[PDB]
Structure formats: C-alpha cells, structure tokens
Amino acid sequence: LVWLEAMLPLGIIGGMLCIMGNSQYYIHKAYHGRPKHIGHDEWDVAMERRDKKVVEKA
Amino acid sequence: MNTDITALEKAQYPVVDRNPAFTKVVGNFSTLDYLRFSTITGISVTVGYLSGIKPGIKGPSMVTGGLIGLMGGFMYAYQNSAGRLMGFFPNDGEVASY
Amino acid sequence: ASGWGITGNKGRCYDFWMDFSECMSHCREPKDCTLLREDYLECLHHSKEFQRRNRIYKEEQRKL
Amino acid sequence: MMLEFAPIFIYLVISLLVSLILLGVPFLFRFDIRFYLVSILFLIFDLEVTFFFPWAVSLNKIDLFGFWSMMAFLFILTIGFLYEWKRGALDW
Amino acid sequence: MILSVLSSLALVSGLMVVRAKNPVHSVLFFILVFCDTSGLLLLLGLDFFAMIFLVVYIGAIAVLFLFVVMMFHIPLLPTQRNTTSLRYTVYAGKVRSWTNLETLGNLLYTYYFVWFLVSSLILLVAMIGAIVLTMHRT
Amino acid sequence: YIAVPAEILGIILPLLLGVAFLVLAERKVMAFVQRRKGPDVVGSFGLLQPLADGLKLILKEPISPSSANFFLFRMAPVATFMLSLVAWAVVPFDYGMVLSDLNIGLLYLFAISSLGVYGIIIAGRSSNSKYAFLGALRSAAQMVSYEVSIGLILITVLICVGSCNLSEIVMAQKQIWFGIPLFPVLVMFFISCLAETNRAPFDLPEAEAELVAGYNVEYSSMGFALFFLGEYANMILMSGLCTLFFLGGWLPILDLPIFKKIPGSIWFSIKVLFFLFLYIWVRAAFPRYRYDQLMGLGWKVFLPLSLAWVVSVSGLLVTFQWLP
Amino acid sequence: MDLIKYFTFSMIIFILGIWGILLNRRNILIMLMSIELMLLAVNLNFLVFSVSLDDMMGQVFALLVLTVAAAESAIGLAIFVITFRVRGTI
Amino acid sequence: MFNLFLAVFPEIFIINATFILLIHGVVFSTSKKYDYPPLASNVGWLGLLSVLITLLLLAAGAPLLTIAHLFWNNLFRRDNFTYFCQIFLLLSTAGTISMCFDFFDQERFDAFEFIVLILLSTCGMLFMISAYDLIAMYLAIELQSLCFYVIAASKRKSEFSTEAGLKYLILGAFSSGILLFGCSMIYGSTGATHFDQLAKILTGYEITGARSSGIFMGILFIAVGFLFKITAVPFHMWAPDIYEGSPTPVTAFLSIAPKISIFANILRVFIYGSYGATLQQIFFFCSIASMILGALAAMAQTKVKRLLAYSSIGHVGYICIGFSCGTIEGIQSLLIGIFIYALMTMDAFAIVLALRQTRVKYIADLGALAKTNPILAITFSITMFSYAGIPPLAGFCSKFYLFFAALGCGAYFLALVGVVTSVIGCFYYIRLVKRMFFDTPRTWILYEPMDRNKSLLLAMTSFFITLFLLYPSPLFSVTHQMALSLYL
Amino acid sequence: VMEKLRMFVAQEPVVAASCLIGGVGLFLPAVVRPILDSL
Amino acid sequence: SKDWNTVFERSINTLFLTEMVRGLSLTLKYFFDPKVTINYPFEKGPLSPRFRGEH
Numbered sequence A: 001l002v003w004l005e006a007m008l009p010l011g012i013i014g015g016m017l018c019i020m021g022n023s024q025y026y027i028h029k030a031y032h033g034r035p036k037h038i039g040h041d042e043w044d045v046a047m048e049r050r051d052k053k054v055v056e057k058a
Numbered sequence B: 001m002n003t004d005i006t007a008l009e010k011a012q013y014p015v016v017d018r019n020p021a022f023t024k025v026v027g028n029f030s031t032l033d034y035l036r037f038s039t040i041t042g043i044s045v046t047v048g049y050l051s052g053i054k055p056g057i058k059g060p061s062m063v064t065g066g067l068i069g070l071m072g073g074f075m076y077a078y079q080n081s082a083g084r085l086m087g088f089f090p091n092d093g094e095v096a097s098y
Numbered sequence C: 001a002s003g004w005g006i007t008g009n010k011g012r013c014y015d016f017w018m019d020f021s022e023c024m025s026h027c028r029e030p031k032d033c034t035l036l037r038e039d040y041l042e043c044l045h046h047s048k049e050f051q052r053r054n055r056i057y058k059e060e061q062r063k064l
Numbered sequence D: 001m002m003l004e005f006a007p008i009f010i011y012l013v014i015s016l017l018v019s020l021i022l023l024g025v026p027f028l029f030r031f032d033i034r035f036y037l038v039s040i041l042f043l044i045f046d047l048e049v050t051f052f053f054p055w056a057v058s059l060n061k062i063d064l065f066g067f068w069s070m071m072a073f074l075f076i077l078t079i080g081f082l083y084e085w086k087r088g089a090l091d092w
Numbered sequence E: 001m002i003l004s005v006l007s008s009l010a011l012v013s014g015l016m017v018v019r020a021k022n023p024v025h026s027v028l029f030f031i032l033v034f035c036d037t038s039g040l041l042l043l044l045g046l047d048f049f050a051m052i053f054l055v056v057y058i059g060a061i062a063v064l065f066l067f068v069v070m071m072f073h074i075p076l077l078p079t080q081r082n083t084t085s086l087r088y089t090v091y092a093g094k095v096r097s098w099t100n101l102e103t104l105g106n107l108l109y110t111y112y113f114v115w116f117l118v119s120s121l122i123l124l125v126a127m128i129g130a131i132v133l134t135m136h137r138t
Numbered sequence F: 001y002i003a004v005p006a007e008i009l010g011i012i013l014p015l016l017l018g019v020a021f022l023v024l025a026e027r028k029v030m031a032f033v034q035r036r037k038g039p040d041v042v043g044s045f046g047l048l049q050p051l052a053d054g055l056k057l058i059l060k061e062p063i064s065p066s067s068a069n070f071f072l073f074r075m076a077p078v079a080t081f082m083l084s085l086v087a088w089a090v091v092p093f094d095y096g097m098v099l100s101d102l103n104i105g106l107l108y109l110f111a112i113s114s115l116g117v118y119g120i121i122i123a124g125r126s127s128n129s130k131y132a133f134l135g136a137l138r139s140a141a142q143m144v145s146y147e148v149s150i151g152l153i154l155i156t157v158l159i160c161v162g163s164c165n166l167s168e169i170v171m172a173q174k175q176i177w178f179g180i181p182l183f184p185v186l187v188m189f190f191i192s193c194l195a196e197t198n199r200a201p202f203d204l205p206e207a208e209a210e211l212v213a214g215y216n217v218e219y220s221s222m223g224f225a226l227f228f229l230g231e232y233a234n235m236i237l238m239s240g241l242c243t244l245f246f247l248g249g250w251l252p253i254l255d256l257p258i259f260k261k262i263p264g265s266i267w268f269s270i271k272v273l274f275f276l277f278l279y280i281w282v283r284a285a286f287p288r289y290r291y292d293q294l295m296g297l298g299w300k301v302f303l304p305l306s307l308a309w310v311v312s313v314s315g316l317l318v319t320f321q322w323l324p
Numbered sequence G: 001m002d003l004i005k006y007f008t009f010s011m012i013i014f015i016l017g018i019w020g021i022l023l024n025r026r027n028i029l030i031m032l033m034s035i036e037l038m039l040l041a042v043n044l045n046f047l048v049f050s051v052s053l054d055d056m057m058g059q060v061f062a063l064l065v066l067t068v069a070a071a072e073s074a075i076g077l078a079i080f081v082i083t084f085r086v087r088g089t090i
Numbered sequence H: 001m002f003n004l005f006l007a008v009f010p011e012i013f014i015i016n017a018t019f020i021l022l023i024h025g026v027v028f029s030t031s032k033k034y035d036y037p038p039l040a041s042n043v044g045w046l047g048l049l050s051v052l053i054t055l056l057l058l059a060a061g062a063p064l065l066t067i068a069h070l071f072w073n074n075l076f077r078r079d080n081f082t083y084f085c086q087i088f089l090l091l092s093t094a095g096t097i098s099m100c101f102d103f104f105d106q107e108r109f110d111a112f113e114f115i116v117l118i119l120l121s122t123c124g125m126l127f128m129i130s131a132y133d134l135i136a137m138y139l140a141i142e143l144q145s146l147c148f149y150v151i152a153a154s155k156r157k158s159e160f161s162t163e164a165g166l167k168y169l170i171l172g173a174f175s176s177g178i179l180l181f182g183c184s185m186i187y188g189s190t191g192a193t194h195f196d197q198l199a200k201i202l203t204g205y206e207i208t209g210a211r212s213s214g215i216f217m218g219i220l221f222i223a224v225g226f227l228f229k230i231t232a233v234p235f236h237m238w239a240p241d242i243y244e245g246s247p248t249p250v251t252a253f254l255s256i257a258p259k260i261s262i263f264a265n266i267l268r269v270f271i272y273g274s275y276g277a278t279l280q281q282i283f284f285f286c287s288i289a290s291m292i293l294g295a296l297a298a299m300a301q302t303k304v305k306r307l308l309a310y311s312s313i314g315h316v317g318y319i320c321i322g323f324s325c326g327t328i329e330g331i332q333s334l335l336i337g338i339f340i341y342a343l344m345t346m347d348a349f350a351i352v353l354a355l356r357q358t359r360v361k362y363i364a365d366l367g368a369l370a371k372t373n374p375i376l377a378i379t380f381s382i383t384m385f386s387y388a389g390i391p392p393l394a395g396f397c398s399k400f401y402l403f404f405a406a407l408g409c410g411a412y413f414l415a416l417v418g419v420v421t422s423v424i425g426c427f428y429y430i431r432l433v434k435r436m437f438f439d440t441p442r443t444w445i446l447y448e449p450m451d452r453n454k455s456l457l458l459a460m461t462s463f464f465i466t467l468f469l470l471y472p473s474p475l476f477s478v479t480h481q482m483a484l485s486l487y488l
Numbered sequence I: 001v002m003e004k005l006r007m008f009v010a011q012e013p014v015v016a017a018s019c020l021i022g023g024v025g026l027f028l029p030a031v032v033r034p035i036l037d038s039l
Numbered sequence J: 001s002k003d004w005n006t007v008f009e010r011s012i013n014t015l016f017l018t019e020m021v022r023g024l025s026l027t028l029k030y031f032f033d034p035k036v037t038i039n040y041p042f043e044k045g046p047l048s049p050r051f052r053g054e055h
C-alpha cells in the first residue's frame, strides 16, 4: 500500500497542531503551578485575588 | 412575562369579565358587530376592484383589498366587542346574559 | 434611575431614586423633598464626597 | 473579565513584529452598482446577526414572548428581503 | 496612561479624516478611529459593544464606504496614600454574575421591545430606499 | 508575566509550519488522485519541499513596484496575515490549552472573519491594474456575502449551547456531537467556509486570466507568500471551527471501548485533518462556479435556508423547554 | 479623574465632526462621514454615562443608535450614487 | 396577553396594511402576464383606504388606548392630547394621499413605493406623538426622517430633486446628531430618560438655588434640534431649496404632517422643561427672527413654491409666538394656529397640484386666471387672503388669538413685530391677487381641468375657510381640552 | 391549489424547503406549546 | 407535468447533493490504486526502433 505517503504531511500537521496546543499548557502549568481554568467570572477572579492575599499574609 | 391590564379611565358601565379571552370576545360578536365587520370588508373589496381596472390587475387587486378590509373589519369588531366586555361601552346585552 | 443594573443585580442609585419619587409623590411643594433629591443626585456622581476628599487633600498638602 | 484581552493584544503585537520581519528579511539578502446593493444587504443582515447574538444567549430567561418579539423582527425583515428578491437585487 | 495614548491616537486619526485629500486615506483613518475607540470601550468594561463596533462600523459601514469610494472617483484628585484598599467588595453580587450579552438581552426583547420593532422598521425603510434610488436593471 | 510571548510563539511558529506543510499535503493528496506522486525528490517524500519553497522566496530579491502607494501596497499583506493569525488566540484545544478564555469568543471570531475583507480591498486597489482591482473587489463582495451565512449558522449553534465561550461549546457536546441533530447545518457551514476562504468550487482568485485574475497578480515573492500563508491559515482555522462546533472539539467518538483514554489534543488534530482532506477532495472533485451564479447561490440558497434553520431550532427548543 | 477623560474625548470628537461637516461645501464624502463621527461621539457618551451611574437605559439606546447610523449612512450613499447620474459633481 | 395590544392596536393595523401593500405591489408589478402594469394608482387607492380604516379604528376606540397603561408606561403614554393629535395627523395624511393621485397618471410617475413610504412615515409619526421618552422620540423622528429623505429624491433622473434630497439628508442628520447629543448629555447628568422621571427631579429646581451646566446645555441642544426640524430662523439653512427641489406632492406632505408631530413632541417636552430661562426666550427670539426673515424674504420671491416655503416659515414663527407665552391660552393659540395653517396649506397645495398639469413655475404664469377659470381664481384669492389674516376668513382667527395670547404674557415687543410682519406679508399675498385679477399680460396660459379628488378637497377646504368665523366653537373647545389635557 | 403548488416546488426546491422548515419552527410554539403546557 | 411523487425525489436529490457525492466517490477510486508515473532518471519511457533523435 502506497497511499500513506500522502498522509505523512497530514500526520505532520496533525501532530504539530497537537504540539501547538500542548505548548500553551506545559508552560502555563510551569509558572503558575496549576493549569488554565475555563470560566473566570467575577466570583472566580475575586477568589483568586483573595487566595493571593491570604497566601501572602500566611 | 408580568402583564397588568388596567385603564386609567375606569369603565363607566358594569365591568364584567375584566380580562376576557380571545375566543370569548370572538364568540361575543353581536349582529351589529357582524354587520360592521361585513360592511368594511365589502367596501374594501369594491374599492380594490374599482381601483385595479386601469393597470389591468382586475382580480388580484380585489383579493388584496379583501385581505386589508377583512383584517380591518375583524380588528374593529374585536375592538368593539372587547371594549363592551371590559365595561367601558354601552352593553345592555351582556349583563342580560350574565 | 430605572432599576436595571449593569451587572444584572440592581441599580446602584435606585433605592435613593425610589425613596425620592415615593416621598415626592405625596408632597405638594417640591421644597420639602429637596432634602432627598440632592441625596439622590449626589449618589449619581458624588458631587459632595469628592469635594470633601479633595479639600482634605488640599489642606493636607498646604502644610508645606 | 477584560483581563483575557491582554494576551490577545500581546499576540497581536508579536504577530505584527513577525509579519514585519518576514518581509524585512529579503532586503538583507468601469463603475458598477450591484456591489453597492449587495453591500447594503450585507449591512442589514449584519445588523440582524448583531441583534441575534443577545437573543440566543438570553433565550431561557425569556420564553414565548422574547421568541415571538424576535420572530416579528424576522418577519419584517423577511418581507423586506422578499421585496429585494423580486426587484432584481439578488440575481445578475 | 493607556487611556490617554489611545485617546490621542484616536484624535489624530479623526483629525486626519476631515483633512485628508484623497477620500481613500480619509476612509482608512475613519476605520482607524473605530479601531482605536473599540479598545477604549473594551477597557471601560463593555466587551459586547467593543466587538459590535468592529462588526458594524468597520465590518459593514466602512466596507460600504470603501466600495463607494473605490468607484466614482469635580474629579477626584490623585490620592493613592489612603485610597488604594478602601474598595469594599460585596460578594453577594459576585455569585451568578451576568455577562454583557445576558443582562442586555434580558430586557432588549421583552420590556423595551417596541423600540426594537421601530429599529426593524428603520432598517426596512433603508432597505426599500436603497433600491428605489440606485437601480438600472437591464 | 514575561512568559506570555513564549505561549504566543508556541502558537505562531507551529501554525506557520502547519501552513507550509499543508501546501505539500494538498499538492501530494491531489496528485495521488490524478495518478501522480507529487514532489518526492527534494526530501524523503517531499518533506523538505516546503523548506525549499520558503528559502527560494527568502532569496530572489523582491521587485517591489509600489507605483501607487509605498505604504498600503506593502501594508495590506501584513494586515491580512495579522488577521489570519489573531483569531487563533481564542480557539481551545483540550481544556486549558487556550490562549485567551474569552466570554465572547463567537463574536470575536465573527468580527475577525468579517474584518479580513480589507486585506483584499486595499491590496487590490494599491496595484495599478483594472483586472486586479475589479477581481479583488468581486472576491471581497463574495466573502462579505457569505459572512452573513456564517453568522447565522453561528447563531444556530449558539442557541443550543447558551454561551459565547468557545471552550464551553465543546463541553456542551458531552451527550452527542452537534453534527448528529443538525447535520444539514454542518453541511451548509462547510460549504460557506469553502466560499469564505476562496477554496474548492468558489476559488475564482485562482481563475488564471479570466474576468477575475486575483488580488495577488502583481506581488513580489514575500507579499504573495504572506497572502498565501494568510489564506491557508484561514483555511485551517475554518476547518478547526467547523470541527469544533458541529463535532466534539476534543471529546472521543463514542468512548465505549477502552483505548479511547488517549489524550484529547490528538482527537482535535485528526478531526481537523479529516476536514482538510474534505477541503482538498472537494477542490479536486468539482469544477468552478462563475461569479454571477456564485452570488445568486450565496444570497438565495444559503441565507433563507440558514434563517429557516435558526427559526426551526429556536422554535423546537422553546416548545419543549430544551433550553440551556 | 476617569469620567472626564472620556467625556472630553467624546466632546472633542463631536466638535471635530462639526468642523469636518462645516469646513467645505464640496467633498460630500467627508461631510457625510462627519455625521458618523458625531454618532460615534454621542454613542460613546451614552455608553460611558450608562456605565458610570450603573443603569441600563444608556446601553439599550446606545445599541439602537447603531441601526439609525447604519441606515443614515446607507441612504446617504444611495443619494450620493444617484447624484452623479445627473450632475457628476464630486 | 392579547388584550394589552388594544392600546397600540391601530398602529398594528397600519403596519400590517403597509406590508400587504408592499407585497402586492412587488408581486404584481413584475409579472409578465400583466406586462408590468403601473400599479401606482391602485396602491395609492388601497393606501388611502387603509389610512381611512385605521382612522376609523383610532377614532371609535376613544375610551380604548388607555388600558394596560402601566405595561406600556416605559414605552409610550397616550393621553387625550395624543388621541386628538393622531386623529388629525391621519386626516392630513389621507388628504395629501387623495391629493396626489392625478400626479401619478398625467405625470406618469408610477412608483408604488412612494405610497408605502408615506404610510411608513405616517406610522412613525403615530409612534412619535405618543413617544413618552427620550428614546422613542428619537427613534420615531429618525423613522419619519428616513422616509422623507428617500421620497424627497424619489424622481431620480431629475436634477433639483436629488440635490434637494441630499441637502435635506445632510441637514436632518446634523440636526439628529445635535438632538441626540443633547439627549445623552441630559441623561448622564440626571440618570433618567422617561418623561415622568424627568419632570420630577428638575421641575421643582431649575436655576433657583444653583445650576448644572450639563442639563442646561442638553436642554439647549434639544431645543436647537427641534428648531432645526421645524425650520425656524436661523435654523432654516436649506429649507426653501428642499421645498423647491422636492416633488410637489412630497412638499405638500413635507410641510403639514411633520410639523404637527414635531410640535406635539415640543409640547410634551415642555411639560418637563420647566426652566423658563432656557426654552421660552430662545423660542421667543427664534419666533421674532423667523417672522422677520419670512416676511422680508417672501417679498422678493418670484417663484410659487419658494413663496409657499417662506410663508410656511413665517407661519411657523407666528406659531412659536403662542408657545413662547407658556400658558394654557398660549398652548390653545398654538394648537388653533397649527390646525388653521394645516388646512390652509392643504388648500394652497391643492391649488398648486391643480395648476401642475401645465407646469406652472413662476408667479406670472397664473396671470389672467380670473377670465379662463374664474372660480379657481376666486378660490386661490380666498386662500391668499386667509394667509393674510384678513378678518372675514379663517386664518385671521388663528393670528387673532395668537396675538391675544402674546398680550396675555405681556410680551408687547412680540405684538408690534407681529403687526409689522403681518402687514408686510399681506402685501405680497395680495400681490398674487394683483397678478391674476388686475394685470392682463399679452400672453395667456391655459390650465386643463383637475380631477374629482382635488376638486372635492378644494371645495371642502374653501367652504371651511370662509365660513369658519360663524361657527368656531368646536375647534376652540377641542383645543382648550387638548391644552388642558397636556398636564392633567 | 394542488397544481400551482407542485409547479412552485419543482422550480424552487430550496425556497420550498426553507418555507417548510420555517413553518414547522413557527408552528411548534404556536400550536404544540399551548397544548403541551396544559398537559 | 408532475405527480407529487416525482417532484419529491427530484427536490430531495437537488437538495442533498447526491449527484455531487457520486463524483466525489468516483474521484477516490484511484487514490489507493497503483500509480503510473516513472522515475525518469532511473527508468525511462518505452521507445521504438524507428525513433528519430540526435543525428
């Protein structure tokens, strides 16, 4: 079978789209410890600010 | 939705059935209401007929005028019937049945 | 003054406005309700708190 | 809230810089009228979509009244679009 | 400082709008005005209108102008000494906080709905007037 | 806070390489259909050919006419490339693998899609050629016309979800993908994206020397390269959007077997690959539309039908109270 | 100061639009885009005032002004198109 | 859920009838079976029928239109004044539509969209009279303005129409921008837009203790916009050109219906504009300037429609006199003058459209009309004398009671200027009578007879004008009830 | 009515399909919803 | 002339792109088939003894 030869560039673009997706995760977790959170409304940002304050005072 | 039907000028006559239903006021059409709902439709149909003889739209203009007149006449009949029901019109025919 | 809030809770200056409107609804003259009207107008854009704080800052700065 | 737009702005700046350097590298080495009508049609339906966005999101809060108040708007502009259709503004 | 530079750039672009010689440059600066005022709206708090300005003014109106032009040619004084942490936040309103779209569509289509239909009639009038004036079908 | 440009570069560079390799991918998978092999002499199987093209365009010093305007004729490809790249800031990959977690993501995507019309208008006028200007204007008109169909299909998707957040839409497809109920909407969206990016049976920009010659007829190596990169990035972006709305963005097929515990970042990739394969298949399957019937089609087959789909979905959800 | 930097900016935009519409009898394009600049200034006024005092009667009217401005621009360009077919004067 | 719509009930019918007319006129004006018929007289007659039907619907339901007023409170409030204004606006629109029928046949101007746009403008005006807000008012103003811009330049291949349409467009957009700036800058300083909540926080306190620059400036901007809409000096930059260039049936409708709605808006605004130092003096000065400029500018005019435009401007000044008083009698004089001026303008434009058959352009064309058509000559002379305020006619009662209201407030300077301008205007009014009864030029122009619509409207209006001072009680009573209903 | 309807449908399948879909979407909350709400 | 049974089939076919998926599936049959091109530097095309080339 030979049709996999044309699927090689498709595999390259798929895997490298994958690494494009995973790059913003393996380094966001690096310098924030915890990954990104989908959401982050007013309550969530208030909770993050309060956590920062309490850890700073602790 | 929060709705509140209330007239600033209160009904002068008996105020039976403050908020009637659509099919109820439709079924309350007296002989006068049918008569005035029919005369408007007839006038509209004949005006649509007479107007549409120069352009050559002999019949479809009559149909369009009939639609306009039918809607207007039904609107007028509904308005009169409902206004009679909420009270602020001379009823003398609804308190008799109520 | 209408009630609907930006965040969808309630107008910030709606309680004052409704108090002023209710009091002025059964008041013949409008000079008895100017006590509340000024309060509501100030709550809109802080026409007196800002003056007070600015005067505090100016009299603190004039210590030089 | 708006703190999610700072990455977008910085991304725009970096994209501008990359695009600039991409073309900076090689240096180191008669009147028609249908267009205007279709543009107005796009403007009208773009306003339609702009109004659609708040409606779809806030559709569970308002039931059987907001839906019909939007359908009336759709009916009015559908009558307008039908009038555009017959008047020869869609086919060339 | 972000507000002042953005406003100054917007003002310069607007001044160039009413002074540019060829209409194309004026239209492009006109686009730039919306481009840099959408950010001003965005940093004010409103995200929906910031995008609507891009979608409508420089998505529909400005492209219309382009098509036409291509042819036919008592403050609070700064006091951070003791006014940086007096902000009394209330957590009662933080739970179930509506975005811009939700709290606008709550009452655009339900309470003030006639003005919505009047706007619809305005759009229909514009649509009708745009074809009874500019049409040479053949 | 200095690590944000690291994320931005990790988004940009793989995406530029993805466009470069997608060019080879289409030139090979289209050649295999026509009993050919495509470029297989430069690299292993042409895997070095995009590098050769890029280096050749880096060399071969630009001609740079710039007869009308030095700035606009040079700024337009920059603008279109920026617009092509900037819409990737909101696309979510698996869960937190998203640059900006906007709450207006669909509106942002709509604005970016509608804002790319200038890149082929100012570029078209800047070149002093009637055949370039008129063709670019017509292509802009086509994209503007299909923009409303794109928006209406987006509203159709938004009705079921209930929020403009892109990451929330995929989480809304836990039960079933949106391609199952409203499949015809998916077909219409795919065809509109084909028309939006000037690809497959709508690509009059590459109509050789007919009434439409293209907005990039007279461009140097790098300006033409920037336009080419930008519109292929648009192709990738629209395939990703089509597979994120009506298909699970990262969700497994039916998660019945045990081997579906693999990372979700590759499900998105294989779905995007499937849609790219459909793009290329449709390109090398059908002939082209003339511009007159393309406009009529886009205004009389996709606008009323998308409007009807909006109305039907909204009515069905409201009737049975199946609302988010 | 934050509300002042918004209101003054909007007012100066409005005055600049007034200037643009009242400095040339010819050049219909900029005289008609000055109207759009004026509408932008008043729209920004509405939005800023709505946000400043926490009321949603400025945002609704701000959004509704979009349609009026768009329709005015469309009708203006229609008249401008039809005025060349008779006069041809820039 | 359906009985709440009896308040906005007539407007629903007129909108639906407009949609039906549009659908009919677009379906049957393109069919090859009927080889593209004109389809303008048909749509005009159907639109006149629809206007009459909605007038009947509005008039009969007088006790209606008030139910569910709390539900409609945030959107529009229609009290007794709104009902009486709308029932008159519909009558004026129907009169204009019936007038502009022979123009659709002899001129051969078969565009059915004309009547549809007139109907849409009528609905916008209906929404405007009851617009009890700072948002609905602007929306309705724009809704009528768009239709007016479109139908002003309806005749495309002509040159005066398109140019006048463009100038009207620019002036209207500029006026709307100013008005919207004023509305925004009074909303931001008060926090309220609804008229109930706007007449409650500034009615008892205007400049007494102190003042706010924003609210005063916004009130001034609103007044400037409203004066621009009614074309009052000096905010009349291009109105005579608009009257010239616009097609005569359009300017017949452009000078009667819009003024009524805009003056209703001004009256409804006056109930909260209780400053007395920002609205009365500006309108006083503008009234004086408008009378002076109209009287001294229509003297030199040799055309017909230019003279009518300047006479309308002068009448707007006299009208503003009655509003400057700011009393019950002032508003009564205002409304009486508006009614009389509307009837007389209908009369004059019926004459002009009658003489449009042979393309009358200048004042001298109608010379020697006392012999060819003596009856039309005497009718037009009666119309001119009614404009002059000659006592034994309508048009003198309005100016009479206007001056009486002006003396009620003790504005003696207004009375003298009114007298001087009345004399000057009477001179150039009787100048027309001279040109067509006394002077007999060598060359005569013959005018073909008119149709039954214009003739019947003309006869009714001419009998109303002459025989009005024998039975004027109903108009006085209804205008006093309207003025008294403005506040309670 | 059955003779012109099929002629119209044959010429414009897309418009007929759109009309049917919109009619269903407007028919569901106008008839099914009021009767379904009463159980 | 139509019988309410053929117009349904014709409208559906023109609405679901059946005649387009026919060609779409046709174009894919040679995708997996063996190719025909020749590696020119190594294997060359078949000539004839009568070929006219360089003198």
Ligand SMILES: CCCCCCCCCCCCCCCCCC(=O)O[C@@H](COC(=O)CCCCCCCCCCCCCCC)COP(=O)(O)OCC[N+](C)(C)C
Pocket: B045, B058, B059, B060, B062, B063, B064, B066, B067, B070, H020, H023, H024
């Ligand atoms: C119910 C839907 C509501 C919404 C509808 C919106 C429609 C708005 C626009 C209305 C357009 C109406 C077009 C329909 C007319 C189509 C043609 C037609 O049906 O009339 C026929 C036939 O019509 C008639 O003959 C009589 C018309 C019926 C009049 C009876 C009274 C009016 C009807 C009452 C109201 C109508 C209610 C309709 C149902 C609600 C035409 O015959 P002719 O062309 O004149 O004859 C041939 C001419 N020639 C020999 C030269 C070839």
Ligand SMILES: CCCCCCCCCCCCCCCCCCCC(=O)O[C@H](COC(=O)CCCCCCCCCCCCCC)COP(=O)(O)OCCN
Pocket: H091, H092, H094, H095, H098, H343, H451, H452, H453, H456, H457, H460, H461, H463, H464
């Ligand atoms: C106040 C004291 C003075 C007032 C005195 C009033 C006296 C009462 C009224 C008297 C009325 C007499 C009418 C006699 C019956 C005539 C019937 C003829 C009707 C008719 O012929 O139909 C059409 C004529 O249009 C028409 O005749 C109908 C359209 C007429 C337009 C009138 C519009 C009324 C609404 C607005 C009025 C103004 C209100 C201002 C406040 C066609 O005509 P055709 O058969 O000859 O053929 C076409 C020729 N073109």
